[PDB]
């Protein structure tokens, strides 16, 4: 006959880091195996289609790295942008929204870059989307997510003021929306200070980005 019920709550901005694409690499297998010498290459021809299989396989990997990077970021139909007036109900996205003074990445999206780190027929190919185009997609995904809730995924990006969006987010977890409005300034300060701990964490230690740095290493 005993139940425990929370008389208060905390809002936590837990970071998660996922690798999405390798460095696109292709090795010109004839110049790697048998470089700058026809006297060798006429011997490599006796192995037949082998060097075509290895160029084919590395090209398959290399186009999948563009496919992965498109499948992750290019989910937004069109590039949403935030208004001039940042009237988001007391919440403070200035550390996660792009900074126009900068490479137009956000503040946290720059710490994430600063925390992370060959001519023998080896080639490294560029990604299809420049790292600045990835920063436009993450800006558009984020500008939809702030100004228009989930409905920019389902259809047209219908605007909704942010203190009504977080009330739909609260109603979605079975907390009655008046719990947000009666606590909105506290919820804003908990979110803003939790975002502040993300800068302090990512600035203080590289050990968070172990998943990406392992894929580079």
């Amino acid at each position: 006959n005993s139940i425990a019920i929370p008389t208060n709550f905390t809002i936590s901005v837990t970071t998660e880091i996922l690798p999405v694409s390798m460095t696109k690499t292709s090795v010109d297998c004839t110049m790697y195996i048998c470089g700058d010498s026809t006297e060798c290459s006429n011997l490599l021809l006796q192995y037949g289609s082998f060097c075509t299989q290895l160029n084919r396989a590395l090209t398959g990997i290399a186009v999948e790295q563009d496919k992965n990077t498109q499948e992750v970021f290019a989910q937004v139909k069109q590039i949403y942008k935030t208004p001039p007036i940042k009237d988001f109900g007391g919440f403070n996205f200035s550390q996660i929204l792009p900074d126009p003074s900068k490479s137009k990445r956000s503040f946290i999206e720059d710490l994430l870059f600063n925390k992370v780190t060959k001519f023998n027929g080896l080639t490294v190919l560029p990604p299809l989307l420049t790292d600045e185009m990835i920063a436009q997609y993450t800006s558009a995904l984020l500008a939809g997510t702030i100004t228009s809730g989930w409905t920019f995924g389902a259809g047209a990006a219908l605007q909704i003021p942010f203190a009504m969006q977080m009330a739909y987010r609260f109603n979605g977890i079975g907390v009655t929306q008046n719990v947000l409005y009666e606590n909105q300034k506290l919820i804003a300060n908990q979110f803003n200070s939790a975002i502040g701990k993300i800068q302090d964490s990512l600035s203080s230690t590289a050990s968070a980005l172990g998943k990406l740095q392992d894929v580079v290493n």
Binding site: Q78, K81, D87, P126, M133, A140, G144, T147, P161
Partner: protein, 65 residues
């Protein structure tokens, strides 16, 4: 020509390499034949063009409190 500078080879120096026989244009369109570092090429008013790809139409969401 991947990774080269055109001096070693209607010519355009992309970040992927020297691109020969594609007309560079200042417009942007959806991607068609993907090249690299934001460049895509297509057959358009006809001839082969190359351009910085558009990610989509820009849309200022009409937000207010």
């Amino acid at each position: 020509y991947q990774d080269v500078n055109c001096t070693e080879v209607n010519v355009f120096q992309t970040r992927a390499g020297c691109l020969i026989g594609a007309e560079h244009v200042n417009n942007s369109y959806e991607c068609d034949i993907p090249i690299g570092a934001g460049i895509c090429a297509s057959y358009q008013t006809q001839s082969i063009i190359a351009y910085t790809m558009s990610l989509g139409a820009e849309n200022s969401v009409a937000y207010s409190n």
